[PDB]
Design a protein around this ligand. Structure first.
Ligand code: NDP
Ligand code: NDP
Ligand code: A1L45
Ligand code: A1L45
Ligand code: CA
Ligand code: CA
Ligand code: CA
Ligand code: MN
Ligand code: MN
Lengths: 407, 407
């Protein structure tokens, strides 16, 4: 029972965490075969990985460094990998019969495209990219209803925590992103845990003047800023709603600054189940690849006595207005989540580059949401994807226009 | 469609909690049918229950209140119960084709007899009585191996918590008290949570002086004293071992004074899952009857932000020597757990009645354990049962002898 896995975005944070936990687990017993790796342009990192894992497939997106990889790879003896390029490369990896599971560690809005081909090929897709679920949830749901054997397994830490709390005899009667997922699993309510980010004790007057420096002073810049505004958590609320079909009024954000309890599920009997560990991405990634089983790791065991104290408080929506906007957009439904995500892409980047202030982020997003009008949701998958792209591009331009008008 | 249930010990704390959650679940649909109620001698309280629930069977252990019962039940119109007595009645109830699940809320070693008969009739046994598991664990395992369709479902709060944390997809491939349970469920280690009892923060000098009045001043007296000495947790360690096939070195007692996290399971990947709620017996009791499903309750939702802080520490074995005794007795195996439980029954009662001091409890138990000589374990059921009873009585008399010698 070898687990055959492809890694998409294998030089990124997700991709490399995945290779690390695979490496360590394989030292205990040989359970994983890394069949394919795919990166943007990091051709020197890719070579190093390839030497180690000897995957059947390699792929780089950027055509420009295609030949240079072929060069690099000659050195490796014993080894005749299939070396591919761009979207046809990804498409060929997703169609191979020797690949069971695909880790999607490609960032931003980009990664949706590989997700789609993975589903079309009825794979198990370990999806870390929350923005794809928030922007294109409707399209994913439609795709997953066509391709009955395809499944998304969540890797975002809180969503993995929720999923780990479930009974798999009930999970296997449904799958993530299905209507009625929460009803089948007897889910009542979610506690979506947050770190709270750096700005959790600041007053309004202090927040008025915080800068991106304050936010960044250990993750990518975009998610770090989102953690600071708590728009990360707002996006995660929508992610929860789509993944697990939990109503917005049944998702509660709670600030847990110790980051040991990763999230909790309240069932209809009011029993609550939670997943706990040190702050970590190895277990979420591993779980996505072993589900519905678990395997041995040599990770450090949680020492609860040493951790000693766990704390929980409600976030202030006045201080973190991005959370409110995320609920508002989610409850409105339609393509409002697409608009939220896109406008936040812009506002985040503006704040990062010192072009706007903290409360301008939510102000711009709010104004874009107000200017959107709900659209007839295409019944046809292809039209639906085009609608999402159009609306995403519209909302980005609109956020930019609001910035330029005031500025 | 309805689940047909018997309640043994219906007038006690477990029994009345069971009837309360049943009452609420049956408001609109007929979810449960209460087929039988059994008590020792509380014939007035039993009458009151019979009037409300109209069970097919009533049973009193104490035959000296039979006539009183028959007289009370006359006052209920159109109600023709089968009114039984003692062991014979218990055995007839267990034999009825019309009963699916039996809640055992009878206290002390005496709970074993009804548990045994329920198993022998291939029933689902919602077992709250821990003393039966501690005293007769190896015997129940044997019985469960013979009676293939019988199941013990744990009701003790922490063990219910553990059971809930497990994946039912794996649980359904085994059953409690079965060899290999922990392997099939990928269990690594158990965090067994405790309230710590009223004496948790006392110094050694203060602890020397404690009295039963201090421990009592809200549950039955025996278990309240065991909570104060932490012999309750020691018993629960042995209960964990047997129910879940977890090695003693992989059970860690943790004092959680807020009593929200009810216990935790660490799986082989080092992910930890926990169950949490307000301190409660309705969820454990209901879950035992609905497993592997859950049903809606109107219990107050956990308000984690209001609870605000959860703490964890290791208990001092110098202060709570009963814990250490239980681990020693459990690791030694054979009939040492039987001896532990029986000597504790006496030592607890002496303390309750102001005849001995706190440290004399552990002293008596230790001396009885040291005094016991290991016996070859009978290979047949009936002989093993007789052996257990013999050793139980022996250990009680020895505890009493030790007490009498030193005063
Ligand atoms: N890791 C974490 O802790 C968390 C991650 N996430 C989610 O994870 C997602 C992935 O981000 P993360 O891994 O953290 O970030 P990174 O920026 O580190 O990941 C980028 C990776 O994707 C590759 N890539 C980018 N574009 C392409 C393309 N067109 N074709 C092929 N490969 C491409 C990059 O290749 P190259 O090296 O060549 O640039 C690199 O391997 C995000 O959407 C985020 O929401 C969510 C919560 C926390
Ligand atoms: N209380 C709790 O929340 C918890 C309890 N438990 C376990 O559950 C068990 C019961 O505890 P609890 O309910 O507090 O105990 P109680 O003292 O409250 O109740 C005991 C019950 O058993 C009945 N009974 C006693 N002897 C017999 C007999 N020979 N035949 C039939 N019925 C009998 C009593 O009848 P009568 O009224 O006639 O005396 C009463 O109904 C114990 O083993 C305890 O460890 C474990 C964890 C939690
Ligand atoms: C050393 O760097 C690492 C930090 C963290 C992690 C785990 C990934 C957490 N994750 O799912 C996120 O979505 C990131 C933002 C959230 C978070 C959660 C937990 C801890 C910190 C931040 P927030 O609640 O929105 O603030 C891994 C490595
Ligand atoms: C109103 O009705 C109710 C009755 C009962 C309970 C909870 C039963 C908990 N239980 O399983 C026991 O074994 C009791 C003793 C232990 C405990 C645990 C949690 C809280 C207090 C004490 P300890 O850790 O040994 O001290 C809750 C409510
Ligand atoms: Ca009488
Ligand atoms: Ca479970
Ligand atoms: Ca072990
Ligand atoms: Mn997250
Ligand atoms: Mn208990």
């Amino acid at each position: 029972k070898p687990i055959n896995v492809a890694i998409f975005g294998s030089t990124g944070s997700i991709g490399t965490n995945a290779l690390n936990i695979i490496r360590e687990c394989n030292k205990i017993e040989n359970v994983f075969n890394v069949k394919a790796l795919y990166v943007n342009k990091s051709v020197n990192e890719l070579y190093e990985q390839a030497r180690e894992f000897l995957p059947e497939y390699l792929c780089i997106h950027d055509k420009s460094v295609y030949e240079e990889l072929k060069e690099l790879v000659k050195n490796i003896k014993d080894y005749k990998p299939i070396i591919l390029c761009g979207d046809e490369g990804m498409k060929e990896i997703c169609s191979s019969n020797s690949i069971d599971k695909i880790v999607i560690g490609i960032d931003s809005f980009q990664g949706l495209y590989s997700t789609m081909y993975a589903i079309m090929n009825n794979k198990i897709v370990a999806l870390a990219n929350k923005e794809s679920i928030v922007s294109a949830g409707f399209f994913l749901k439609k795709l997953l209803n066509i391709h009955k054997n395809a499944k998304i397994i969540p890797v975002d830490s809180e969503h993995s925590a929720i999923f780990q709390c479930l009974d798999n005899n009930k999970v296997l009667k449904t799958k993530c992103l299905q209507d009625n997922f929460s009803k089948i699993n007897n889910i009542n309510k979610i506690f979506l845990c947050s770190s709270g980010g750096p700005f959790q004790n600041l007053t309004m007057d202090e927040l008025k003047n915080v800068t991106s420096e304050n936010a960044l002073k250990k993750m990518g810049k975009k998610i770090t800023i989102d953690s600071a505004t708590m728009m990360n958590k707002g996006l995660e609320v929508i992610e929860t709603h789509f993944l697990f079909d939990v109503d917005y009024n049944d998702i509660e954000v709670i600030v847990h600054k110790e980051c040991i309890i990763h999230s909790c599920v309240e069932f209809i009997d009011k029993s609550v189940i939670s997943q706990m560990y040190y702050p970590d991405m190895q277990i979420p990634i591993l779980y996505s690849l072993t589900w519905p089983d678990r395997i041995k790791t040599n990770l450090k065991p949680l020492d609860l006595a040493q951790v000693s104290t766990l704390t929980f408080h409600k976030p202030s929506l006045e201080h973190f207005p991005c959370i409110k906007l995320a609920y508002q957009a989610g409850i409105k439904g339609n393509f409002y989540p697409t608009v939220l995500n896109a406008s936040n892409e812009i506002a985040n980047n503006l704040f990062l580059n010192n072009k706007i202030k903290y409360f301008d982020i939510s102000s711009i997003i709010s104004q874009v949401l107000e200017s959107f009008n709900s659209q007839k949701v295409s019944e046809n998958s292809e039209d639906l994807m085009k609608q999402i792209l159009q609306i995403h591009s519209w909302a980005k331009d609109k956020a930019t226009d609001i910035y330029n008008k005031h500025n």
